[PDB]
Amino acid sequence: EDEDLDTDNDNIPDSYERNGYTIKDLIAVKWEDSFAEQGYKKYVSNYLESNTAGDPYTDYEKASGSFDKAIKTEARDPLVAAYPIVGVGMEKLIISTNEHASTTGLSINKGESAYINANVRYYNTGTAPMYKVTPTTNLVLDGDTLSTIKAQENQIGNNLSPGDTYPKKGLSPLALNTMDQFSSRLIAANYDQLKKLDAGKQIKLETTQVSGNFGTKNSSGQIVTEGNSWSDYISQIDSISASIILDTENESYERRVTAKNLQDPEDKTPELTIGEAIEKAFGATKKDGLLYFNDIPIDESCVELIFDDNTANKIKDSLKTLSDKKIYNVKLERGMNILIKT
Amino acid sequence: EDEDLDTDNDNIPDSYERNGYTIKDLIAVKWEDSFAEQGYKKYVSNYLESNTAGDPYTDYEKASGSFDKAIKTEARDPLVAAYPIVGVGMEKLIISTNEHASTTGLSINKGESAYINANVRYYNTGTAPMYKVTPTTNLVLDGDTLSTIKAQENQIGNNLSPGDTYPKKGLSPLALNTMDQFSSRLIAANYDQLKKLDAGKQIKLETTQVSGNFGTKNSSGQIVTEGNSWSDYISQIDSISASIILDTENESYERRVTAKNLQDPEDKTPELTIGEAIEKAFGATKKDGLLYFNDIPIDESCVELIFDDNTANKIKDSLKTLSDKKIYNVKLERGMNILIKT
Amino acid sequence: EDEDLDTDNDNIPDSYERNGYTIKDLIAVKWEDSFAEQGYKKYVSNYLESNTAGDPYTDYEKASGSFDKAIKTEARDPLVAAYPIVGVGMEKLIISTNEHASTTGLSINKGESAYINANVRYYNTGTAPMYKVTPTTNLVLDGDTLSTIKAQENQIGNNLSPGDTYPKKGLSPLALNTMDQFSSRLIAANYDQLKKLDAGKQIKLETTQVSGNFGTKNSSGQIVTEGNSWSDYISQIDSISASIILDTENESYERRVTAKNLQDPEDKTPELTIGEAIEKAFGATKKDGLLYFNDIPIDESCVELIFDDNTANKIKDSLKTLSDKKIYNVKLERGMNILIKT
Amino acid sequence: EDEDLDTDNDNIPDSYERNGYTIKDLIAVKWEDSFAEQGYKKYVSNYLESNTAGDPYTDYEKASGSFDKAIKTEARDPLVAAYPIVGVGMEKLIISTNEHASTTGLSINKGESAYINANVRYYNTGTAPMYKVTPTTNLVLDGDTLSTIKAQENQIGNNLSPGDTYPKKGLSPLALNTMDQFSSRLIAANYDQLKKLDAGKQIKLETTQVSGNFGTKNSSGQIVTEGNSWSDYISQIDSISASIILDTENESYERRVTAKNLQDPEDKTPELTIGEAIEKAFGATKKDGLLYFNDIPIDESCVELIFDDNTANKIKDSLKTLSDKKIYNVKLERGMNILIKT
Amino acid sequence: EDEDLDTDNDNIPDSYERNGYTIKDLIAVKWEDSFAEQGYKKYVSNYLESNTAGDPYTDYEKASGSFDKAIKTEARDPLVAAYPIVGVGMEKLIISTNEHASTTGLSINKGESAYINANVRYYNTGTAPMYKVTPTTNLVLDGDTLSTIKAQENQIGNNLSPGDTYPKKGLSPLALNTMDQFSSRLIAANYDQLKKLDAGKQIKLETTQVSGNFGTKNSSGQIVTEGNSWSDYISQIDSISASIILDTENESYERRVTAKNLQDPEDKTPELTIGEAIEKAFGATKKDGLLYFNDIPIDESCVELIFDDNTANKIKDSLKTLSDKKIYNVKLERGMNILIKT
């Protein structure tokens, strides 16, 4: 009954955070099943923790709506993890060749003769914005693993809205050829690697890491992104949560949802199943008693649940005890990943 | 009746911010319909929020007039959004070619032989000033997507008054050729791209982002623009508001006006219609019971409401229920845009 | 009667700042018409504002004289605005040509062959000093709009007294050829622009902006110019005040004085007319019941009041209702400008 | 009688600072004419000001002797101004010519062929030390106004005692050729300006400004010169005081002494006359009832009081009313200057 | 009798600092002549000053022994001044000449052809250490006054013990050829100055100034040398003290001892005599009723008191009134200097 006693100092009780609860007028309301039709929802969380997943907001601050505005409405639930991830796309790699007087002809230096140039474009898929992007990307020549570069002081960009490109849709890509104000590097073994680049235009561009920022909110301390860094939360998140990826023919989505280790006798997060988790992640609800999208179904005759080895072997080891034989009705796995092709 | 009880600690009551209200002698006055003729106006705002739109001032601070002086009088209302946006214009791109001894002639380096130079000019259209401008702009060569640059330490400029150019009217434009004190880059493939520049002078300049500052005001802490940054508010604003653009033959204006999501049962901003919102944005009032400008009519036989697809399809999907058939009398769409040609 | 009740916390009452007042022995004295002959003057200001013009000093602190000492005695009145503006003059542009072995002769590089050099001199005309000057200036070649530069670390200068040059009168000008420790730039298209400079010595120098500092004063916090900046007050000032320029055959003057918008029901600055405003700006008083200078008459038979379009059209639109037909006796215009030739 | 009531919070009374006073045992003693023979002196100052002249110390702090020790004993009186000024002397300008293979001979670059070098030496004449000197000096070629330079990071120097040189007497001068670690500049138009330097060795060196620091003293906060800049007091001083220059055939002296504007009805500094002020500045006293030096007479048969125009015209305009006809017995002029040649 | 009343807040009484006193167990003991044989000594100081000499420690803190440990035992007395001074010695100047292809031979650049290199060594003679040394030294070519340089970041050094070299005895000297990571400068007029260096190896190395640090001591704020600078105490010291230089055939010492001006009626330091001051500076005592060194007599038949002009003329001007005719028994001179050759 909790007797209105808090154990975390997170302004929320611990039977409220044990049974179902929701939030009205910035005050913890207990629960009644009536106001589900009113438009409200239900939440459960960790009554012993100041913040369930790793993400830097507390349980009440994520559940109310006084944390940000730009973050999508799915992230107001304490099970999901409000954190973004950005991908870099490449095109139009151009070159300039043979520095002095050619396209050897006695005045072509085997180093520093053909400078490189690439065009890229960032895009964010996830749940949150990042008010700065510094990605480090590297280039590879069909298995030769050539130079790596940081974003310099003029390709850093700025705030990155959810589901958007870095140049907003209808603009030309971003140019890249620098190593701190130094035109970058010859495709190295000159009369060899340029002739590899003759019929072997396989300059592949990979991303390794990005770094960004977020924002905290007060009244007097209004909004600051000066030192709030995102590079020291991914290790906290990914060693707890599991990953869920959905994709249509025109969009993509990735989410990180938490779980529980069964061996630890002192974890107090609620249990889950993946048929509840795909509902809890997105805006997907039930349209005929089974899980549907905004306009699409997601059911067993419509899923293409493409697993991998660490997920498939554990589900094939644990799909023997139950008799209902439902893949959606299994306990989560701390570290798993799931693909929903459609 | 609210019993003089504040719920946000924003020095304003919550029936005052629920019904109509205005501000006299820096004190919240309730409302009387008499003094509209006196010169006063009416306001309404969000009784649960410390700041209605995303912009960094509060409800009372925007409604009174003790926030700035340079901001135009339309922004003193808590529904509009006091934030600016700057455009860059280009002209007069000049070149210097063929470095050593020509206009190949055996001494023309295939990289770094024709340095580029552009002339630019900023302008601000919106509602607010920005006390610093760092725009990042890129150049594109009829679909070749060439280099991008930040404004250096000597092209940054200074305070930018609303509706003005960066060099005030009657001055020459700005020169641009730098990559941190390095003359920029050859039009890359020398004997190819210069001959593309022979008959193909299509060096298009595009803007990608800008960054600036604003100003907070105290008595002892008078005016500071040292750390107040504008790059961490656009993501908060644009994921809430809608956009409205007006343009005559000699000027242009763009505004951001807020709205409400109907599915969210804990939003407490008032509702709107676009026929009220075009009046609420500008200094436009009614001159014959219908909306007029300073000296211009803006009515259904004079508007050119040129939509786009996401606005036109939703208004054509929701123009079936009502019987009056008025495009001005519809609920707003959180994310829509509107062009009003004249 | 005000009952000695302050509404701004600016240590001055609000019938004192409503009727006339003056200041004796650092105490607000009410007003009496007797001691005008004594040497005292009269002031009136905004009883609802902590600083009635934009300038960073308060009403009392500007009215007393415990703010600075180098500021001219006209600025002790709350109607005028104590802020300076500096103009740069150019002369003696010299060159150095044709870098390797000439005055083409086969060893002249089409970029980087003739470095430029200009001589400049600052001066201040206005009401205040500026303890640092960083002007950004650009050069133009008969409508070609060439490079722009910031004052470097060795050409910034120092404190700049009112009505003085930057090198005090009787010294040679300043030399300018830098782009951060890099001899400047060739007059670009070498064998073209040097031959334009043959008979076309039209290198015009233009100013775009300056930046400086000011000084606040305490006893324990004596005088600091390290954090104070002037680039965040001009937008506040110029969107309020009007401008007045006077010039004899040997000097020049420009001032910024305030006004009121008539539509706003909650502004509380007193009214004005230009016939009292030219008196209130300068040290000009009446010598025969009409406005005279230090030794010069300034009256309708001596003025050459050269307007512009926004001033002339409004004065010819509003010079119909009155019957006295006096241009000096009109309400001010918020944004106007006035030249007084003599 | 002042009733021991202070009006400035400067620990000194206000009839004490109205009549004569002096300071014994760090306590304000009133005045009695007996102890003038004891070795004491008399002072009078501004009972409404925390510091009379611009200089950063207060009235009591200058009158006692607990402010510094290196400042000369004339400055312990609240009428004089304790501030220094430094002059730069030039000699021995040397050159290095014709960079590649000469003293044109087909390999002499018309820019950057003959680097310059000058020898300088600072000296201070005035009343105070400066613990750092950064002078900006420029060079001129018989009316061509060549480059200007700041003192770099290794020609700054250190503390500068009053009446001394920067290298103490018996050392070689300072070498100067840098523009931030870059050998300076060719005497520009090479085959022209070197031949101007053939018979026209007229490289004149001029000073424009200097910058330095001073020292404040506490017990716990002992002595700091970190931020106490001198560049923000000269504008306060020179718009109040007048200047007095004395010179023998082996030394020089310059001082700044305060005054009063007669039109201002609320200034409260004492009056003066120049025959009192020349005694009040220096250690000069009366040896036969008339002003003498340490060993020299300064009287009407010994002065060579060389005025300028703004001093001569005002003294010839105001030497008519009095009947005694004494130039020493006139009221001071706020802005005047005086040369006492001997 | 002083009634145990302090006037400076320096924890010491003011008859104790008026008569003789000594410090036992960190408590001010009054005096009695008995404990002179015990090993104790006598001190007297300025009862009106918080620190009698210029040096940054107080009277009590210098008299006790709780200030530092590396400072020599002579400096524990408030008459002497604990500050060091460092001399630079030079040897082994080497060269590297004629850069391209020679020892003119058509390929010797008249600038930048023979880089210079010197060997230096610091030493300290005085009373204190300095935990950092940055000396600026200049070079002169037989009266041509060549370049000057600061010690760079790799030649600064570290803590410098009293009476030691900078490399401790038995190490090679320091190499010097830099102007901020730039091999320094040709001996300028190449084919002239190298031939001056043929038979004219007169590269004299002079020192001009140094800069260093010191150390303050607390328990919680244990030892800091971060901002404690020595460049702002020499002007305070040298305008008060006189200088005394002693030298054997194998060592040298210099000291700065305070004095008193007679014309100032409010100085309160005790008087001195030079025969007492030579004893009070060093560890010299009396061995036969006359002053002896550690093992050396220093008396009138052993001194070689080599004066200079300002000392000799004043002692020959004031050696007439007294009848005993003793040069050791004269009042000190504020500004004098004294050499004791032995």
Side-chain angles (χ1 to χ4, degrees), chain D residues 23-25 39-40 69-70 76 96-97 99-100 102-103 119 153-154 157-159 166 173 175 219 222 225, chain E residues 50 108-111 138 144-147 150 179-180 185 188 206 209-210 231-235 240 264-266:
Chain D
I23 295 302
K24 300 178 221 176
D25 56 273
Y40 287 121
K69 292 300 152 66
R76 285 171 62 165
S96 301
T97 49
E99 198 261 357
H100 193 77
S102 303
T103 177
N119 296 149
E153 57 183 357
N154 46 25
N158 265 336
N159 56 329
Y166 159 69
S219 200
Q222 53 277 0
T225 76
Chain E
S50 175
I108 298 94
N109 304 114
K110 194 180 175 182
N138 59 341
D144 287 34
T145 69
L146 201 63
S147 59
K150 197 186 207 170
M179 299 194 313
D180 215 328
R185 166 88 190 170
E206 310 271 3
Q209 81 181 30
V210 307
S231 183
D232 41 357
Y233 275 78
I234 310 294
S235 315
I240 297 188
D264 284 283
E266 206 146 32

Side-chain angles (χ1 to χ4, degrees), chain E residues 55-117:
Chain E
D55 47 349
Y57 315 102
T58 64
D59 308 331
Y60 158 74
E61 199 192 39
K62 266 200 293 184
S64 90
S66 88
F67 65 107
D68 199 293
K69 296 299 154 68
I71 300 196
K72 304 270 295 313
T73 47
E74 295 169 352
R76 290 166 67 166
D77 174 71
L79 295 172
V80 308
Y83 87 104
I85 183 64
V86 279
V88 192
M90 202 266 297
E91 52 251 21
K92 194 48 87 159
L93 182 129
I94 80 171
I95 48 173
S96 304
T97 73
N98 279 317
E99 198 260 0
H100 205 81
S102 305
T103 176
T104 180
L106 215 64
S107 198
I108 298 94
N109 304 114
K110 194 180 175 182
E112 308 321 294
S113 57
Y115 301 108
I116 204 167
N117 177 26

Side-chain angles (χ1 to χ4, degrees), chain D residues 92-96 115-119, chain E residues 144 146 185 188 193:
Chain D
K92 194 45 88 160
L93 186 132
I94 82 171
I95 52 171
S96 301
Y115 301 106
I116 212 166
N117 177 26
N119 296 149
Chain E
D144 287 34
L146 201 63
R185 166 88 190 170
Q193 292 197 15

Side-chain angles (χ1 to χ4, degrees), chain C residues 13-65:
Chain C
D14 280 359
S15 159
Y16 281 21
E17 216 176 353
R18 159 174 285 107
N19 302 322
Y21 82 102
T22 173
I23 293 302
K24 295 180 222 172
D25 56 273
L26 308 190
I27 277 302
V29 184
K30 181 184 148 52
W31 174 239
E32 272 315 308
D33 311 331
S34 84
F35 40 72
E37 52 87 22
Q38 274 209 33
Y40 287 120
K41 289 303 178 82
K42 188 262 290 180
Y43 310 84
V44 72
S45 170
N46 213 310
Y47 79 105
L48 266 169
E49 303 319 301
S50 175
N51 39 3
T52 168
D55 45 349
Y57 314 107
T58 82
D59 302 334
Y60 157 75
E61 178 197 46
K62 260 200 295 183
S64 89

Side-chain angles (χ1 to χ4, degrees), chain A residues 23-26 38-40 64-65 68-71 73 76 92 94-103 115-119 129 131 153-161 166-168 171-177 181-183 217 219 222-225, chain B residues 7 9 48-52 56 58 104 106-112 136 138-140 143-150 152 179-180 182 185 188-189 193 206-211 214 216 228 231-236 238-240 261 263-266 334:
Chain A
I23 293 302
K24 305 176 215 188
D25 56 273
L26 310 188
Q38 277 208 32
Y40 288 155
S64 69
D68 203 299
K69 287 299 151 67
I71 293 175
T73 52
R76 293 169 72 167
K92 194 46 88 159
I94 80 171
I95 48 172
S96 304
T97 55
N98 264 333
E99 200 261 359
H100 209 91
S102 302
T103 174
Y115 302 104
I116 205 166
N117 178 25
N119 298 146
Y131 300 114
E153 57 187 359
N154 46 32
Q155 297 94 18
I156 41 172
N158 260 341
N159 53 328
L160 191 45
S161 40
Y166 157 70
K168 277 176 163 40
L171 279 182
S172 63
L174 174 145
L176 191 45
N177 43 6
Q181 279 66 234
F182 190 109
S183 292
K217 171 175 182 307
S219 196
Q222 48 274 0
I223 281 298
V224 277
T225 73
Chain B
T7 63
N9 296 319
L48 265 165
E49 302 319 301
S50 176
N51 41 4
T52 304
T58 79
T104 185
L106 216 64
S107 191
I108 294 95
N109 321 64
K110 215 210 161 183
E112 314 314 296
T136 51
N138 57 342
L139 298 103
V140 55
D144 290 33
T145 69
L146 201 63
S147 60
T148 173
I149 46 174
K150 193 178 207 166
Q152 285 294 118
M179 302 190 313
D180 215 330
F182 194 113
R185 169 137 189 99
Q193 290 198 12
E206 307 271 14
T207 79
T208 57
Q209 87 198 18
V210 306
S211 163
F214 63 100
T216 170
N228 302 149
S231 192
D232 50 356
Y233 274 77
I234 314 292
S235 313
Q236 181 170 331
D238 266 322
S239 159
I240 299 190
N261 180 25
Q263 294 184 359
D264 286 291
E266 277 225 86
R334 192 179 210 189

Side-chain angles (χ1 to χ4, degrees), chain E residues 117-315:
Chain E
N117 177 26
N119 296 149
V120 302
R121 159 164 292 184
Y122 312 128
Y123 46 84
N124 168 51
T125 50
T127 39
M130 264 165 60
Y131 303 115
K132 191 80 75 71
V133 277
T134 58
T136 62
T137 171
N138 59 341
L139 297 102
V140 50
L141 169 54
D142 68 275
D144 287 34
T145 69
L146 201 63
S147 59
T148 173
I149 45 176
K150 197 186 207 170
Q152 285 294 117
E153 54 186 4
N154 48 24
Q155 300 148 348
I156 41 172
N158 263 338
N159 50 329
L160 188 45
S161 46
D164 282 28
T165 64
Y166 159 69
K168 282 180 161 42
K169 187 67 62 178
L171 282 181
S172 293
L174 272 53
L176 190 44
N177 42 6
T178 61
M179 299 194 313
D180 215 328
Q181 280 66 236
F182 192 112
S183 292
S184 75
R185 166 88 190 170
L186 157 67
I187 310 99
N190 175 72
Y191 199 51
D192 180 74
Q193 292 197 15
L194 265 292
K195 302 307 122 183
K196 195 168 295 183
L197 209 49
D198 161 80
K201 188 211 168 173
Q202 323 304 315
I203 311 295
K204 299 307 182 190
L205 178 131
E206 310 271 3
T207 167
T208 59
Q209 81 181 30
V210 307
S211 166
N213 286 135
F214 62 100
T216 171
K217 170 174 185 303
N218 207 345
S219 173
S220 76
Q222 53 280 7
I223 279 298
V224 278
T225 70
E226 54 86 12
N228 303 148
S229 282
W230 260 121
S231 183
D232 41 357
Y233 275 78
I234 310 294
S235 315
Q236 175 158 327
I237 288 180
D238 267 324
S239 175
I240 297 188
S241 165
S243 298
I244 282 176
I245 301 174
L246 193 139
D247 46 316
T248 78
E249 306 250 15
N250 55 336
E251 215 178 4
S252 314
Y253 322 95
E254 55 268 33
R255 304 292 193 272
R256 257 65 154 166
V257 192
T258 42
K260 182 155 142 153
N261 181 24
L262 286 174
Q263 293 193 2
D264 284 283
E266 206 146 32
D267 194 344
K268 279 306 199 304
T269 170
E271 316 311 300
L272 272 189
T273 322
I274 81 181
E276 185 182 319
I278 295 155
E279 189 270 329
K280 192 52 73 57
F282 308 102
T285 182
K286 302 183 181 181
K287 271 185 66 175
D288 51 358
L290 281 78
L291 300 180
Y292 272 48
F293 206 59
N294 292 278
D295 286 315
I296 297 306
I298 313 172
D299 284 323
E300 196 46 77
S301 200
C302 193
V303 290
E304 275 81 14
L305 181 45
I306 303 182
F307 259 23
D308 44 350
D309 57 82
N310 179 289
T311 51
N313 84 301
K314 283 304 175 291
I315 198 54

Side-chain angles (χ1 to χ4, degrees), chain D residues 13-262:
Chain D
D14 275 0
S15 177
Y16 281 29
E17 217 177 354
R18 157 175 285 107
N19 302 322
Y21 91 106
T22 177
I23 295 302
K24 300 178 221 176
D25 56 273
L26 308 190
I27 278 302
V29 197
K30 183 182 150 52
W31 177 244
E32 298 289 42
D33 311 330
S34 77
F35 43 71
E37 50 87 22
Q38 280 208 30
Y40 287 121
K41 289 304 176 83
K42 188 261 290 180
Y43 312 89
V44 69
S45 163
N46 211 313
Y47 87 112
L48 265 165
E49 302 319 301
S50 175
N51 39 3
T52 72
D55 43 351
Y57 317 100
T58 82
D59 309 333
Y60 156 75
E61 196 183 68
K62 267 199 294 182
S64 90
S66 71
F67 64 105
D68 199 296
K69 292 300 152 66
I71 296 195
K72 298 271 296 311
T73 51
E74 309 147 9
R76 285 171 62 165
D77 162 78
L79 271 191
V80 304
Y83 98 105
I85 182 63
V86 289
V88 189
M90 199 266 299
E91 60 257 18
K92 194 45 88 160
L93 186 132
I94 82 171
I95 52 171
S96 301
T97 49
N98 264 342
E99 198 261 357
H100 193 77
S102 303
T103 177
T104 183
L106 208 74
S107 187
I108 292 94
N109 320 64
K110 195 179 176 182
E112 315 313 297
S113 59
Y115 301 106
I116 212 166
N117 177 26
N119 296 149
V120 298
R121 160 163 296 187
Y122 311 129
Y123 44 84
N124 169 49
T125 49
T127 40
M130 271 165 62
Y131 297 109
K132 190 80 74 71
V133 277
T134 59
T136 49
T137 169
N138 58 341
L139 298 103
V140 52
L141 176 45
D142 68 276
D144 291 335
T145 70
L146 201 62
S147 58
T148 173
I149 46 174
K150 201 181 207 169
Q152 287 277 147
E153 57 183 357
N154 46 25
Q155 294 94 19
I156 37 168
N158 265 336
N159 56 329
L160 192 47
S161 41
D164 285 28
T165 62
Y166 159 69
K168 282 175 168 42
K169 192 66 64 179
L171 283 178
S172 277
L174 268 55
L176 199 44
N177 42 6
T178 36
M179 300 190 313
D180 217 324
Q181 279 64 248
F182 190 110
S183 283
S184 75
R185 166 78 172 170
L186 161 63
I187 310 104
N190 172 72
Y191 200 51
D192 165 64
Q193 292 198 16
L194 265 292
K195 301 306 122 183
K196 197 169 297 183
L197 210 48
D198 161 82
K201 188 214 168 172
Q202 323 304 316
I203 314 293
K204 300 307 185 191
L205 186 141
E206 308 272 15
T207 82
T208 57
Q209 88 198 17
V210 308
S211 167
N213 293 130
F214 62 100
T216 170
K217 170 173 180 303
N218 207 352
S219 200
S220 88
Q222 53 277 0
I223 282 297
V224 285
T225 76
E226 54 86 12
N228 306 145
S229 279
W230 258 120
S231 181
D232 50 356
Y233 277 80
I234 314 291
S235 315
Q236 181 164 331
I237 288 179
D238 277 327
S239 161
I240 299 189
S241 160
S243 298
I244 282 179
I245 304 172
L246 192 144
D247 43 351
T248 78
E249 291 180 355
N250 54 335
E251 216 179 7
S252 315
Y253 297 98
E254 56 269 34
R255 306 293 194 275
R256 257 63 151 163
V257 191
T258 46
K260 181 137 68 74
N261 180 25
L262 285 173

